Amino acid sequence: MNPPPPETSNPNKPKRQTNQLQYLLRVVLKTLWKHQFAWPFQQPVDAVKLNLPDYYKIIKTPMDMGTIKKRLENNYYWNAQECIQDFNTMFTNCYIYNKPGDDIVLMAEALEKLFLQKINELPT
Ligand SMILES: O=c1[nH]c(-c2cccc(NS(=O)(=O)Cc3ccccc3)c2)cs1
């Protein structure tokens, strides 16, 4: 069973746009999205579709790149660090739910390396 997906808007939360957040959408996310290993991470985990009935028994802070993309498009984040934390949650969730060496983990590990390469330098 699937919980509601994470919010992509919140009227109580202040919005912001920064050069670094623009870069996270235009360069970082949109490049990762095109990687051959991006597909499992482009939408929230669908536990019914994927037959993972224990996914949300284990993962209590789900995150995916579809959600991150919508948040960036919404100017949902206050700063780049907040967005970077969502990417890190996404990767960590994968390592938590699975086992070292699993195919899905190899995919997340490759994306994480590419992500780190791209966020090493952000615009000023
Ligand atoms: O811990 C995690 N497992 C997954 C996972 C595992 C097995 C299969 C899938 N398939 S899927 O991405 O939902 C289906 C899909 C297939 C093609 C394009 C976009 C999505 C995801 C994402 S995070």
Swiss-Prot record:
Note the residue range shown relative to the complete protein. 44 to 166 of 1362
Family affiliation? Belongs to the BET family.
- Crosslink feature (Glycyl lysine isopeptide (Lys-Gly) (interchain with G-Cter in SUMO2)) location: K57
What processing steps or modifications follow its translation? Answer: Phosphorylation by CK2 disrupt the intramolecular binding between the bromo domain 2 and the NPS region and promotes binding between the NPS and the BID regions, leading to activate the protein and promote binding to acetylated histones. In absence of phosphorylation, BRD4 does not localize to p53/TP53 target gene promoters, phosphorylation promoting recruitment to p53/TP53 target promoters.
Q: Give the domain section of the comments.
A: The NET domain mediates interaction with a number of chromatin proteins involved in transcription regulation (NSD3, JMJD6, CHD4, GLTSCR1 and ATAD5).
What is the tissue localization of expression for this protein? Ubiquitously expressed.
Q: Could you say which disease the record links this protein to?
A: Cornelia de Lange syndrome 6: A form of Cornelia de Lange syndrome, a clinically heterogeneous developmental disorder associated with malformations affecting multiple systems. It is characterized by facial dysmorphisms, abnormal hands and feet, growth delay, cognitive retardation, hirsutism, gastroesophageal dysfunction and cardiac, ophthalmologic and genitourinary anomalies. CDLS6 inheritance is autosomal dominant.
| Name by which UniProt lists this protein | Bromodomain-containing protein 4
> Organism source for this protein?
Homo sapiens
Q: What does this protein do?
A: Chromatin reader protein that recognizes and binds acetylated histones and plays a key role in transmission of epigenetic memory across cell divisions and transcription regulation. Remains associated with acetylated chromatin throughout the entire cell cycle and provides epigenetic memory for postmitotic G1 gene transcription by preserving acetylated chromatin status and maintaining high-order chromatin structure. During interphase, plays a key role in regulating the transcription of signal-inducible genes by associating with the P-TEFb complex and recruiting it to promoters.
Compartments annotated for it: namely:
Nucleus; Chromosome
Site feature: Acetylated histone binding: N98
Miscellaneous: JQ1, a thieno-triazolo-1,4-diazepine derivative, and I-BET, a benzodiazepine derivative, have been tested on tumors with success. Treatment with GSK1210151A (I-BET151, a I-BET derivative) has strong effets on mixed lineage leukemia and promotes myeloid differentiation and leukemia stem-cell depletion.
Self-association and partners: Interacts with p53/TP53; the interaction is direct. Interacts (via CTD region) with CDK9 and CCNT1, acting as an associated component of P-TEFb complex. Interacts with RELA (when acetylated at 'Lys-310'). Interacts (via NET domain) with NSD3, CHD4, BICRA and ATAD5. The interaction with BICRA bridges BRD4 to the GBAF complex. Interacts (via NET domain) with JMJD6 (via JmjC and N-terminal domains); the interaction is stronger in presence of ssRNA and recruits JMJD6 on distal enhancers. Interacts with NSD3. Interacts with NIPBL.
| Disulfide pattern | none
Q: Where is the Bromo domain?
A: 16-122
